[PDB]
Amino acid sequence: GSSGSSGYRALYPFEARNHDEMSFNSGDIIQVDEKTVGEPGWLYGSFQGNFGWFPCNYVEKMPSSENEKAVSPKKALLPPTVSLSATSGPSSG
């Protein structure tokens, strides 16, 4: 439960009553980005076609789905790439 999304649940339904504010209802997960920095006592997140700055309160940090099973995603190798020709020599006759 760290580095990579946060996960929040909108307590009450708030309306974007500002310039670049967000709009969401209660019972809606708020993909808050615990990285973006800006305002002091403000929290920025990204919801269904809704992205703005909201007050740190309305939302309530949710649990990591009742504890999580530490998974270790081993590293995998990817195949190479191949380029192709372009353009060409047109004519005029």
Residue 10 pairs in a beta bridge with 59
**Which residue do the tokens 């380029």 mark?**
83
Q: Give SS3 for 15.
A: coil
Cα–Cα distances (Å) from 41 to 28, 37, 50, 56, 57, in that order, read 21, 11, 20, 6, 9
Residue 8 pairs in a beta bridge with 30, 61
Method: NMR
Residue 5 backbone class (left: φ over 0; alpha: ψ -120 to 50; beta: rest): left
Q: What are the start-end ranges of the E strands in the chain? A: 8-10, 29-32, 42-47, 50-55, 59-61
- Cα 42 to Cα 19: distance, rounded to the nearest angstrom: 14
Question: Domains in the chain and their CATH numbers?
Answer: 1-93 (2.30.30.40)
